Design an enzyme around this catalytic site. Sequence first.
Site, short mmCIF file in Angstrom:
data_model
loop_
_atom_site.label_atom_id
_atom_site.label_comp_id
_atom_site.label_asym_id
_atom_site.label_seq_id
_atom_site.Cartn_x
_atom_site.Cartn_y
_atom_site.Cartn_z
N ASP A 1 89.81 5.81 27.59
CA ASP A 1 88.62 5.78 28.43
C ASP A 1 88.09 7.19 28.56
O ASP A 1 88.68 8.02 29.26
CB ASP A 1 88.93 5.19 29.80
CG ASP A 1 87.76 5.30 30.74
OD1 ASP A 1 86.74 4.62 30.50
OD2 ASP A 1 87.85 6.06 31.72
N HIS B 1 72.95 -20.18 35.48
CA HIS B 1 72.62 -19.48 34.24
C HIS B 1 71.68 -20.34 33.40
O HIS B 1 71.40 -21.50 33.72
CB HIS B 1 73.89 -19.17 33.45
CG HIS B 1 74.81 -18.20 34.11
ND1 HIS B 1 75.75 -18.58 35.05
CD2 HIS B 1 74.95 -16.86 33.96
CE1 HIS B 1 76.42 -17.52 35.45
NE2 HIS B 1 75.96 -16.46 34.81
N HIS C 1 91.14 5.20 36.25
CA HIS C 1 90.88 5.68 34.89
C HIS C 1 91.93 5.15 33.94
O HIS C 1 91.62 4.59 32.88
CB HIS C 1 90.88 7.20 34.86
CG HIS C 1 89.99 7.83 35.87
ND1 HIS C 1 88.62 7.76 35.81
CD2 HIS C 1 90.28 8.58 36.96
CE1 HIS C 1 88.10 8.40 36.84
NE2 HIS C 1 89.09 8.92 37.55
#
EC number: 3.1.-.-
Lengths: 1364, 123
Positions: A8, A838, A981
């Site tokens: 990441d 949707h 993270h």
Amino acid sequence: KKYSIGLDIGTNSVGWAVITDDYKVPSKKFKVLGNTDRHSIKKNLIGALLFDSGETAEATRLKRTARRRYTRRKNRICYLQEIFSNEMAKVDDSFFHRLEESFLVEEDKKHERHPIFGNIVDEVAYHEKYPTIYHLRKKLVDSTDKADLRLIYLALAHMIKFRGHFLIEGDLNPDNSDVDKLFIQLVQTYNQLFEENPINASGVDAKAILSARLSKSRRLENLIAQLPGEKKNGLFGNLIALSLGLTPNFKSNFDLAEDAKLQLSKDTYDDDLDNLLAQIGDQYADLFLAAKNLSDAILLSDILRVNTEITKAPLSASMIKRYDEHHQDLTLLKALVRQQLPEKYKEIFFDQSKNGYAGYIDGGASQEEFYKFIKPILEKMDGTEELLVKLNREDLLRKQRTFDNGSIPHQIHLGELHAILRRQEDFYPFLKDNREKIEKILTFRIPYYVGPLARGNSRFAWMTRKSEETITPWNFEEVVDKGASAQSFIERMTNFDKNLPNEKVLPKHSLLYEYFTVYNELTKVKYVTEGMRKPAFLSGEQKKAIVDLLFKTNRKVTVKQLKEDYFKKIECFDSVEISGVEDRFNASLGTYHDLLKIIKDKDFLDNEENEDILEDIVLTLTLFEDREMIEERLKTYAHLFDDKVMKQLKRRRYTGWGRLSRKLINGIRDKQSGKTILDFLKSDGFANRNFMQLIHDDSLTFKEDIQKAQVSGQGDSLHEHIANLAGSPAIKKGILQTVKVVDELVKVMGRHKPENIVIEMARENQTTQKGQKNSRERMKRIEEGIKELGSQILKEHPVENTQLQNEKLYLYYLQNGRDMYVDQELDINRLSDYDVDHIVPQSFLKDDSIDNKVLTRSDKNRGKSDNVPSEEVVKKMKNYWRQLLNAKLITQRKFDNLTKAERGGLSELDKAGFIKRQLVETRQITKHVAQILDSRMNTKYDENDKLIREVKVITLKSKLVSDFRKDFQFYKVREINNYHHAHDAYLNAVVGTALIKKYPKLESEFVYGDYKVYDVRKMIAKSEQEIGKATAKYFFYSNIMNFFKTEITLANGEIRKRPLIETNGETGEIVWDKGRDFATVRKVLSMPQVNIVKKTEVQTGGFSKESILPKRNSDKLIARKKDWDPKKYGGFDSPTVAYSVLVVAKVEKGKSKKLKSVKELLGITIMERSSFEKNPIDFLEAKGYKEVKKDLIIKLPKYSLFELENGRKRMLASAGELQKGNELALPSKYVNFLYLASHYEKLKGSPEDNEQKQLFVEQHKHYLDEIIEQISEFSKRVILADANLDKVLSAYNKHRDKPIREQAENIIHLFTLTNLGAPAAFKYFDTTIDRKRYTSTKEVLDATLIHQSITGLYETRIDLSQLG
Amino acid sequence: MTLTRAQKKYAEAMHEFINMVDDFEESTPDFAKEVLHDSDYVVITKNEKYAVALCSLSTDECEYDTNLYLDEKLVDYSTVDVNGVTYYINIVETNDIDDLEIATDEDEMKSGNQEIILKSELK
RNA sequence: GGCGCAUAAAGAUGAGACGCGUUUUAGAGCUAUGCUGUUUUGAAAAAAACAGCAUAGCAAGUUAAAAUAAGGCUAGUCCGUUAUCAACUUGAAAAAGUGGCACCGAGUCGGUGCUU
């Protein structure tokens, strides 16, 4: 053991995670060096690197060009001094000495105290005779007798220090300074641009109105009263407003979304200007530059007001008029205050701290601060007339050296400089010999192309010389090789092309670039004549006809002029609907019509032969500003142009650069037709594509031709390769640190290579997270839609943007208070049960957008089809949908989705689009990071010409880890700890390796390389579900993320359940064990030990704070020179410590001055770092440490992690300030609870699982007490804020009965007691609790230092209590 | 022309201010430039100065009973007059460690009395 | 998430110039009283100011010089705030090199066995 690595990459964080086959992160006992007694640390191979952002280099460019301009100005002074010095030493011995030491205190000053004239009497007589220097200058111009020579030096040195802008070139003719010509130039620009509503300025008198004595707004409205009237808030009115200095607001003129205010006189104008230009199109920057130079012309005629006594000094006479009216208004206002307000006289004229007059002069206070101060207490007094009209015109008590002298052109200084030099040349023959010398010291500007006048030692210079001596402004012509300097300037200051490197880009207004952008717009316009019902794009001869007919006739052509002059005039069609262009053609041949009105020859520009002539002309105008190197780079082209257009075309300017290059547009060709990009976009046949498709077409050669050049743009070193990327230096710091992490991490894992590097990188964001910058354009869409359709809704139910984060309300407004499914009215009070619907469902692609979500009453008012609902729905609602689309509430994408079933259904290209929009990634920088990593990790060639691509560097988007995060409840809360993270890196690794095991057939779309051209025509079914274990198709349900699930909830309520243990089709290997892989992932997201590393960098930057603080008796100040002691001169304060080094030595302690052994954490500033690393024990002996031990010095930068008793980790941050180095691990049940409870209303889903999760919230109310228990048991160990923890415990106890949403959001605020880094103050319910700072640095030196590596797996634990 | 990171981060900070309160003229203090560099925060309070927030320094593991110190330090306040009220745009530096002073008992009330509209950090 | 018009946006680096801003000095601050300050006639204070420091009242107040990262050596009308940077072993510097593995578990990593 095979493994993978998930990465990441962010601006402030690199997250790295290592996984295996069974998705567990490994567990590897690591050796630890140093001298502590822990010799083996078990660590999980998950973690992140934390580092503060890579700051961009333009702050240094500002400070460096400031250093240069100060050095050039000092050398102009030194040039004038080395002229005058001989006969000055004839006249006054130490005059230049006294001006050199004018700064010094009387003790340090080794001459007399008075700089001019020496002794006490003559300096006083000088200041009485000349109270400012503009009196001196207005005397030396307006006199005939001689003057004193040092006094003439004062005049000329004040001329050539402060000499005004060079921005207009030539002399002061009335074509660039008389504001009648500037205003009529603005009118010419405006009529040249619009031509509908053209404003007519025949009878206006812009000089006597825009330049007369009045207040600014009253000056504005007279002008709009002259012309027949646009508005005081129209474009031209707000443009005159910009031209006068007062702020207009352009959001009503162009109808933008956000509020955009452009003040000319601000120090942040021309960035507000270009980020307004981003919203409007760059055909307006000439109009705004006409605004700016009209404003400088107005404001120049505002300083200069002396025109009757026109005698050769139009500036100095104006400033002594302003001095004398300042003086008479000061005596008036002092006598008037002591007349009418005997109090607030000491607070006005003796004040020096409260924006009064003594703050306006002696203290530091602005002009407009002073006017905001003194407008009340001059509105209050009795006789105050013409002391308010000159406040509304901003001229009472106005200084001379103000901020508005940035508009004085240098020719005014040149004119009265010329006058001083030829009034004095008769008495001083010294100046009759050097008058051209003086005027060349003044009017010499080092041009743009020459650059820094270095002699090889710069990093920035491209001066190449025609001689070898010192470049003074005299011999700048016969030293600088200007042709070669301009050539090296071109090759320094061109820009390389992004998708065809080793090539120069075109200028932004290149003529073939405008042909390119007109064809890139016209390739997507499609016309429907009367009676075919098939929208077809334009053919070759039709495009040739329209470009040769209307673009070459008018500059901007709208759809009305399009149909009028081509389909009505040429095709003779009454009405043909036109699809791709909304109102006006976004592209325009601005360069073509500019050059047509310059050189007055259409037949010259219609030739294809002259394109190198015209592109050299446009490149010359783009690169150079200077009249000489434009007239000499156009003397080649004087053969064609009859010398009056040449003085007209050299005036023409451009800026910026195009995105592309000429070898990429009309350059590379296809082997099957020999057609360039321009040749395809003229005549593509039936199927017209656009440029992005022509470079993303694997069928055509062009992507491979780009790949032919992308090999060349790669340096052998890593750092130059990363510098070759396109992005911020923050994200390039992230890329370089993740490559450091990959190399260090493959050094960890047995020195093996992984099987996959999976990458996501979503950063460099400047969208303000779409919280408040979005709702304004949401209401903009709503209000202009209600404007166009004409049916009132906010005459019945208005809601402002404070509440418009609710998505169902926005969907209520966009379908006009109706329902798009059944002709119904949506009940407003009962919207809470109306479910979220949707169109393309959650089993075809995961989406939460307005173009996919709609609102309706029931679940199945839709239909029963898994596609867009049935033909009975869409034919019946086909009346209402056209009425609502033509008002622009909803997208053409969503209309095409709701008109996708009328053309049969989802095609192969349609589902191909639905799998391209989730799997491949469009930003270039992620592809370049993948290019870096597979070029560094896959390096073995073979006997053939192919890299054996062992480590498949594979690219995710963010939405894949985002819905793996949300849908399977791996909920992310940023505010808890910095582990997110690393957990995002782990989910990157899981989703990447699971997609590469389950779908190896799609590796030609999201792994970098050149894999097979076998598209997705065969891996999706043309019908429903295929046969088991022999299916050539991958999945007919076009969502890629389905195979992680158990239920597949369709748009028809069915659970089309997929198998429990997933397997691969092509090999029969398990990819996803649903019973234990989610157990494994949710156990990995509950690791208590995750390698969080703060990168210990040495602080590089400024020497100190740069506010120069006055004469104070402290030690803390920094001397501004080596002989300027801050106890008498003042100086800078707060030196930045680069690294806090450690000293274990002996000081002379006590009254007997015994050499007592000390251990102190000394601070090494940035000013002193070079002298430190010269000889460190010599400096530490100089500082006051004796018997210093050179081996026993340990360097500790900022963020140097220590570890103290009981696992308390504290990262150093200054010479004596610590930070919180501990992370707070929280189990995944608590994080899921805090994300659900803090998003207890805004779930944005169907209410079934929302009821499920809300019951999960309401039943686990014990988790809040458990979390506060855990934070207390943590902060009693590694924070030791006793009083702060007692405050938040008592404040928790008081608000215990508060609801779960507010209490959850305030516990997520409460986590700032335990985050990483600096302590902060945080708002729990009302108790805004003060922070605690960790300034005890004598507790640190007895404790364990840790030298973590770049990933933190390798620690060198130095114990500091073992030292002496 | 082109501006520093410190007055870039101030530039979106005041841009986050100018939209959401009201619409108004006379926008700019915008500042002295060298003062925007050496100040850590741009707060904006309502009708009053930013009365300085406060902290405590634990000293040599024998930190005394509740001595509060002024961690921030106001260096420049400058007011904007949104139609009725006077918003005080005020950029605040922190204090260093050696030069902390003891805050009086009045200031502990003032930070709880405050109405911080927007505290936007900038280095 | 903010797919925001199914297309995907636009990226850094760099050269020139003005304008302020900030800091110190120079723009003799005057009058009154009080205190330290030296004589006269001195046989101790008594006053003739000469200077310095306080408190009031008045006098103006706009400008200039210098500096605008300390400075550096290559001495340029150049350079000095961007990237770089964990220890340790080599190397002048660049640069290179250094750390065992499975399993059971977890409170910031532990433990066992295997291998050395």
